[PDB]
Amino acid sequence: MFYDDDADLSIIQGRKVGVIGYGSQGHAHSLSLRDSGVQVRVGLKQGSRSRPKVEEQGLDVDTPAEVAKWADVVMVLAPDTAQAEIFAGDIEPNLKPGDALFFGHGLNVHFGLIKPPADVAVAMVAPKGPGHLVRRQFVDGKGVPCLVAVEQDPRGDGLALALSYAKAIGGTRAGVIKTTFKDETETDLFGEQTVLCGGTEELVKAGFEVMVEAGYPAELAYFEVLHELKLIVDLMYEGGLARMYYSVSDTAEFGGYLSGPRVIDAGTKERMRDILREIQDGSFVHKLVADVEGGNKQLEELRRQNAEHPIEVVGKKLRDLMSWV
Amino acid sequence: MFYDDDADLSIIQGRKVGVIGYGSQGHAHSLSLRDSGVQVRVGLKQGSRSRPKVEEQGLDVDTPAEVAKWADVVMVLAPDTAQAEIFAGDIEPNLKPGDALFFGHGLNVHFGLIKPPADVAVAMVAPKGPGHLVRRQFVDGKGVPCLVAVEQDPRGDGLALALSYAKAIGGTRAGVIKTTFKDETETDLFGEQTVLCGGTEELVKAGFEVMVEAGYPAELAYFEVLHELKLIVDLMYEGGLARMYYSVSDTAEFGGYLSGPRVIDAGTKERMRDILREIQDGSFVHKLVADVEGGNKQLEELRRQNAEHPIEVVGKKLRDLMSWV
Ligand SMILES: [Cl-]
Ligand SMILES: [Cl-]
Ligand SMILES: [Mg+2]
Ligand SMILES: [Mg+2]
Ligand SMILES: [Mg+2]
Ligand SMILES: [Mg+2]
Ligand SMILES: [Mg+2]
Ligand SMILES: [Mg+2]
Ligand SMILES: [Mg+2]
Ligand SMILES: [Mg+2]
Ligand SMILES: [Mg+2]
Ligand SMILES: [Mg+2]
Ligand SMILES: [Mg+2]
Ligand SMILES: [Mg+2]
Ligand SMILES: [Mg+2]
Ligand code: NA
């Protein structure tokens, strides 16, 4: 791991940094880079809803093409599925030999949606927390750990430059892990699909369905598989499985140890491996890009179905009771 | 549902409430009862781990039997597996005709581990949040939704008494839902086993294993299935599936919609139905009680096995980098 003493802040301080996009990460990076003495400009199309906010924070904003021409380091933090078009239309025609093209995730480069030219460095700085936390920790003199990767390095200083950037957003205060674009994106997609945004939600829905079908009230079903999951995951986030299991009752702990491996069995793990294979072979990403090109039809259909699940109906009613939410 | 105008605080204010056991919910009951003008004493053995924090709050502490003798409402917060022995020895002979026996969960009465005498009320008040939140809401003039059940009611006033108790801890400020001991405990155990403390953890572990067996770094695996789950579950807790899916990227959302139902499917639901049957038929509880009687040997063996999982090794290392946890 790399820490503050492994990174030289004067490197990034000597580079003009363009941040393309002003979502959570673009906001956190741009403000922290500026605080660290870096000359920053934000790249947004002229009609962007974010332009007035960038300007209110005292930052200069230009189009992505203008920022790419001006900058020595172009950090791309636009939405995943929008990056290829920004690259082809705005960034690629304006890259200069010896520029560095930075990303917050490995997807676009790894899967060939963006094919950088040979005359630029290509690197990634990926903080392991939401932008609000990246910024809050930085302002308080601390940091959020980051992943860094260097995919192309024709000037030989790509890692030093990426570590300098990480230091300028606080990442080396906590620690930086070096990885690859391939590993970052394949593990990210895999975790999203099997656990974060697929598996856990389907597990909650399935438990809810079983209870309602058995004639238990939907309100109790909501509490006992969804509402109560926040405490569990908060405990794991802070102290791992050990902390959570110590905190819950012996009845919950014993029940979890016996029933968990029945719910998630060897066959479930084999299906995970199938989902990983379809990430690794490019087929999932091909399907995603095709759906985007067609107007997000399948995404929008599946979105509506999940939004209409009965857990959503009862959950809205119960969350209306909760004055801290 | 029941609200403040449905409950009469003067009822519980006229009762002597003995809280037997304490644990993480103890303050949410005992401090709010006291603030609401109720006389409270806490029954704990001399060696109890809760004694220091109870004494720090200036609550009078005595043995369970002495508190039960003094009290005319006995609220049992002790661990579910310890309640039957406390009840038989310390509570039952000290329930005078017309006393009330209260619980925060339905397990012991529903499964017959505690058989109350015929001359007492038997009721449940179950706040639906962590104790710290229930108490904080109360202090701020607000509340957390509660469940209330009345299992035995010789004087005909048990619901009024339970609602008065709920009002004194803030539950009627937010809303009280009527249920039964049976439904509270069967849904609780089912959710703990299939989702909260079994299924989600085994899903996380399986995903971690798949990544590290495929050669990806354990550090990335930890982040992508465990660390990042907190943001997801926080979003669902606040706004359901819809809010979470709106807030994650298109790639994460589309991937979850496609891969989630491949990981968790109809086969999973059938296994959940078997787990539910073993809750309903008393066999899980019988196995739990027998293990407790034998010295917790199976629980301790499974606890050790889980504590040794490789996600725990890398997780401790990475959480040490995070100052905010
Ligand atoms: Cl973010
Ligand atoms: Cl409230
Ligand atoms: Mg304004
Ligand atoms: Mg302009
Ligand atoms: Mg220049
Ligand atoms: Mg991820
Ligand atoms: Mg992602
Ligand atoms: Mg324990
Ligand atoms: Mg005393
Ligand atoms: Mg008697
Ligand atoms: Mg009667
Ligand atoms: Mg529960
Ligand atoms: Mg429980
Ligand atoms: Mg379904
Ligand atoms: Mg039985
Ligand atoms: Na008594």
Q: Structural domain boundaries of chain A?
A: 1-179, 180-325
CA distance B243 to B231: 12
Domain range A1-179, CATH architecture: 3-Layer(aba) Sandwich (3.40)
Based on its alpha-carbon atoms, the radius of gyration of chain B, rounded to whole angstroms, reads 22
What does DSSP assign to residue A4?
G
The Cβ of residue B246 has, within 10 Å, a number of other Cβ atoms equal to: 12
Residue A142, exposed/middle/buried by CB under 10 A (0-12, 13-18, 19+)? middle
Lookup: tokens for A189:
């997609």
Place of tokens 């992505």: A64
- Min distance A168 CA to chain B CA atoms (Å): 18
CA distance B43 to B70: 10
Q: Which long-range contacts (CB under 8 A, 24 or more apart) does B110-119 make?
A: B110/B181, B110/B182, B110/B185, B110/B186, B111/B185, B111/B282, B111/B285, B112/B282, B113/B83, B113/B84, B113/B285, B113/B289, B114/B83, B114/B84, B114/B87, B116/B92, B116/B151, B116/B152, B117/B92, B118/B152, B118/B154, B119/B95, B119/B154
Lookup: tokens for B241:
């599936």
Which residues from B are below 8 Å from A188, CB to CB?
Answer: 224
Which residues from B are below 8 Å from A292, CB to CB?
Answer: 250
B202, B213, B287, B313: best to mutate for the A interface, most A CBs within 10 A: B202
Interface of B with A in 199-258 (CB under 8 A): 199-207, 209-211, 214, 216-217, 219-221, 223-234, 236-242, 244-245, 248-258
- Min distance A189 CA to chain B CA atoms (Å): 7
Most distant pair of Cα atoms in chain A: their distance: 67
Which residues from B are below 8 Å from A205, CB to CB?
Answer: 264
CA distance A284 to A306: 20
Task: Judge whether A265 is closer than 8 Å to chain B, CB to CB.
Answer: yes
β-strand pairing of B121-127 with B100-103: parallel
Q: Are A256 and B302 in contact (CB under 8 A)?
A: no
Evaluated on CA atoms B125, B129, B135, B141, the torsion sign reads negative
| 3-class SS letters over chain B | CECHHHCCHHHHHCCEEEEECCHHHHHHHHHHHHHCCCEEEEECCCCCCCHHHHHHCCCEEECHHHHHHHCCEEEECCCHHHHHHHHHHHHHHHCCCCCEEEECCCHHHHCCCCCCCCCCEEEEEEECCCHHHHHHHHHCCCCCCEEEEEEECCCCCHHHHHHHHHHHCCHHHHCEEECCHHHHHHHHHHHHHHHHCCHHHHHHHHHHHHHHHCCCCHHHHHHHHHHCHHHHHHHHHHHHHHHHHHHCCHHHHHHHHHHHHHHCCHHHHHHHHHHHHHHHCCHHHHHHHHHHHCCCHHHHHHHHHHHCCHHHHHHHHHHCCCCCC
CA B318 to chain centre: 29
Q: Specify which residues B147 forms β-bridges with.
A: B126, B177
Q: Are A235 and B325 in contact (CB under 8 A)?
A: no
Two domains, one topology: B1-179 and B180-325: no
CA distance B296 to B291: 5
Evaluated on CA atoms A73, A78, A81, A84, the torsion sign reads negative
End-to-end CA distance of chain B, in Å? 38
Q: Are A204 and A230 in contact (CB under 8 A)?
A: no
Q: Are B269 and A206 in contact (CB under 8 A)?
A: yes
DSSP per-residue string spanning A74-127: EEE-S-GGGHHHHIIIIIGGG--TT-EEEESSSHHHHTTSS---TTSEEEEEEE
Do the chains contact at B199 and A264, CB–CB below 8 Å? yes
Do the chains contact at A273 and B210, CB–CB below 8 Å? yes
- Tell me which CATH code domain A180-325 carries: 6.10.240.10
CA distance A284 to A271: 15
Closest residue on chain B to A221 (Cα): B187
Q: How many CA atoms lie within 13 A of A135 on its CB side?
A: 14
B182, B186, B187: best to mutate for the A interface, most A CBs within 10 A: B187
Q: Determine the length of chain A.
A: 325
Which residues from A are below 8 Å from B124, CB to CB?
Answer: none
**Way the structure was solved:** X-ray
CA distance B247 to A6: 35
